[PDB]
Amino acid sequence: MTDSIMQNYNQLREQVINGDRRFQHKDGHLCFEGVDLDALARQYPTPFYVFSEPEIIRNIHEIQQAFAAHKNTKTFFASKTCSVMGVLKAIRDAGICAEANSQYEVRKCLEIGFRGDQIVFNGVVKKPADLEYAIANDLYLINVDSLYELEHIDAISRKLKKVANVCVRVEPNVPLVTAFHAKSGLDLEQAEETCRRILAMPYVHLRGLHMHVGDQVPESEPFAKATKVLVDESRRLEEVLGIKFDLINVGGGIPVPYKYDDENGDPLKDNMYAGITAQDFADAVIREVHKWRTDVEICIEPGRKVTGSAAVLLTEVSCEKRKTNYDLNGNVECHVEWKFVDAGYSVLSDSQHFDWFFYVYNASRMTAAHDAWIKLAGPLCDGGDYFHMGVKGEEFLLPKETHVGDIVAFLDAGAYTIESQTVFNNRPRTGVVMIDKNGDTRLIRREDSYEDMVKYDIYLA
Amino acid sequence: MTDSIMQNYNQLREQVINGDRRFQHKDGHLCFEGVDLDALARQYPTPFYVFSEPEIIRNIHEIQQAFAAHKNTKTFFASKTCSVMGVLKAIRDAGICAEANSQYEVRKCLEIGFRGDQIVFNGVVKKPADLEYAIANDLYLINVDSLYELEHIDAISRKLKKVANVCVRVEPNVPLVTAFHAKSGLDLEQAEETCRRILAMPYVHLRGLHMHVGDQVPESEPFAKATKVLVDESRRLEEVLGIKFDLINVGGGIPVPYKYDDENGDPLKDNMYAGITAQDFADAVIREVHKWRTDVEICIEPGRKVTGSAAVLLTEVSCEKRKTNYDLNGNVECHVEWKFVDAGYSVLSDSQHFDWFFYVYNASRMTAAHDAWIKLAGPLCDGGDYFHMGVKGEEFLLPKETHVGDIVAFLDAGAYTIESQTVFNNRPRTGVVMIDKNGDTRLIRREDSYEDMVKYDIYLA
Ligand SMILES: *[C@@H](N[C@H](CCCCN)C(=O)O)c1c(COP(=O)(O)O)cnc(C)c1O
Ligand SMILES: *[C@@H](N[C@H](CCCCN)C(=O)O)c1c(COP(=O)(O)O)cnc(C)c1O
Ligand SMILES: [Cl-]
Ligand SMILES: [Cl-]
Ligand code: NA
Ligand code: NA
Ligand code: NA
Ligand code: NA
């Protein structure tokens, strides 16, 4: 029943403003960390994202508390999740480390104040220039993804006379088929010879094995099975090769709740429901590692969990229309109420390209019943630019009183939402605002200007 | 049979270098307009796109020749397809007009030398500032997408005391449901009152009606049926309102061949096969318009057809690995040869997000049989960043002699491929090179630098 769907969604709405650590209401408006989001969107041009340093801190606390049973745990935020410098700074100030996924990500982590010993550099394509930059900066780990890349690591560490610290990425076949569907890592069967080669290299230091299971993983079993494979091989290689590993790096993949009404959801069928918590991830990993060693360092690489819940996208309702389907005799078959916001898939890419659900509310009318079925469209000149991941099918719920000028909020908009923006239609990539630990706001990324649209081009004026 | 697939693909390869108006071979390498693309990729850092001014000109000729039966045809390149200034300049110098999809697109079209009377501004969200800029610049057309937007056009044109020239966009119900699936335009039922209202406005001039059917449309029927609706309503409104329309704007959607072996394809099932040519589009449109008037101006808005065939993405094979699935006795079930190029979906977005096929060849070994099944991966730290739209399933064909350092070419890479790039993983958006009419090359867009990417951020140190 759609009445039951509407009732349930309004129960969720009420829970945002009465039972959510991030949110409040004031003057009829949604507030984030005490900041009125309607008011904030009158001071900065929409669309823009607003991040919460308090919520990032809460997320990091969940992750670290989860690993209390293993003292020697090192946490590296996967910076491909969000690398706006002010977000990286909040993460650095919250006391964890950083994982980087390109030369420029390494450089920005160093610039914002992560030390070399707080940085892991991962990748399937690490060109000589990338490896030379990483090795020269004394990174804590550079993963080894292939035998071809390892030849460059050997040659460049020799040229620099500088030790490269490495972890060998192994991707276990844990039942998709690994050889067909996992481009990353080496096969389990190649780990021994790879480690053998590294031991003999004068400037390459083997620190352990590495894996990464995936993203938004709704079950603990894959982490447990894959960690066991890497643990069993670590234990075996210690005996065969006569070494003691510094660490094991188990990657990321802790899910974030994108739908909260867990009683109504099956995470295995709809992974917008978070199937597990950080504690479940930690229990699975730590249990497997401790079957081998309790003293070894465990490295983790959470991305999504650090920032996903910690931002809201604010976008203004900028136009409206009613479209009507008529039958062949001119009688109404249905009306569709379209609301157009100033953010489309060029601003919130995963809503379109990855069928990602985010809660949508009228932030200007947050205490009003969301009692009208509407379709929510973006501003791109593209028939596919509307939000298909609705409350019911492709339909959302907003107050029937919704007006052009109101501010719509997408919740849980903090992971994989900034660097994935485009200038399609030459609409600018968005500004980003930060709410600090004191509840004060500041701009941390400007909106792309016109001069930004053309400065990259070379043309006679 | 896969031998037949391999034989067919190699026949296609031979037709590229011995049959295609764009390409030749020299020194074993793919040439585009006589430019050796292996050599070019040693002069500019990969990945980058190279555009051909000669091929843009050929595409425009096809479009304009198709409309020979209707002298008063005005052609507007849909600049959301590609708005790199050097590409826009080639299109301007080839003698056609420009359609724009945001305030900044209007501005860049004016900057590069399109006059106001050569610019159409379309959109579903045209905010007051957008409309004021457009009206102040005397645009040939601003479409009217909604009644709400029309109120701003009336108020702003009055404020400026400048006539706004408009076309009313009407989206016909041509049989899944226009009201549910088409966010753009007014309903046919609203056209009459909307036009009557415009006639009464002192600073708004009604030019005609507008539609746009869609993109990569593989049949002529949707264009004929939709044009007839617009033509019938135009003729009816001329009588009812006592006016003579300047024009009718029938939009874009002429497809481009992404697979060429039409004898093996069903365009209605796989629209990488172009189901129609520009001549088919023009026949359908012109036939319907001439049932009303032969003197009226027909406006068309081709995007994809102007540039799609006119660029190649050049990307270097930057790593390689073999993965093997073993049975439980250690015997080999299969091997997978992974080749990694330095372009992934952040560079060629539609290959991932829209399941778009592009021909892939080894440009460095273009005269060699492409006789080895490989999987082609990008450099992003994302298991999904590999090219799934293969020659057979997810598998591509390259010479068994392929080596790291070879240059891979993606053909037909000129539509919707530049502005859709991202800085995911902080890999830079690509440079762009142009081959001019004289066959000489120049950089027309730089690769994003480290600076460029961090300079939008506001941070302490
Ligand atoms: C990132 N995970 C990648 C990319 C996920 C999809 C992004 N649109 C994957 O292979 O799934 C990644 C992480 C962080 O993962 P989270 O899911 O915790 O954010 C950690 N380590 C590595 C090596 C990654 O690539
Ligand atoms: C463009 N309309 C889009 C094109 C597809 C975008 C895919 N990322 C659609 O969804 O139909 C457009 C054009 C040009 O269309 P082409 O297919 O010829 O490039 C012309 N007129 C208008 C009003 C458009 O929006
Ligand atoms: Cl840590
Ligand atoms: Cl023209
Ligand atoms: Na606004
Ligand atoms: Na060594
Ligand atoms: Na290169
Ligand atoms: Na008028």
Swiss-Prot record, chains A, B:
Q: How does activity depend on pH?
A: Optimum pH is 6.5-8.
Q: Which residues carry this modification: N6-(pyridoxal phosphate)lysine?
A: 80
* Chain positions recorded as pyridoxal 5'-phosphate binding sites: 253, 301-304, 416
Looking up Gene3D superfamilies in the UniProt record yields:
Alanine racemase, Lyase, Ornithine Decarboxylase, Chain A, domain 1
Q: For this protein, what is the EC number? A: 4.1.1.116
Q: Does the keyword Lyase apply?
A: yes
Fetch the Pfam families from UniProt: Orn_Arg_deC_N, Orn_DAP_Arg_deC
Q: Which reaction does it catalyse?
A: D-ornithine + H(+) = putrescine + CO2; D-lysine + H(+) = cadaverine + CO2
Q: What does this protein do?
A: Catalyzes the decarboxylation of D-ornithine and D-lysine. Ornithine is likely the physiological substrate. Has no detectable diaminopimelate decarboxylase activity in vitro.
Q: How does it assemble?
A: Homodimer.
Task: Indicate what this protein is called per its UniProt record.
Answer: D-ornithine/D-lysine decarboxylase
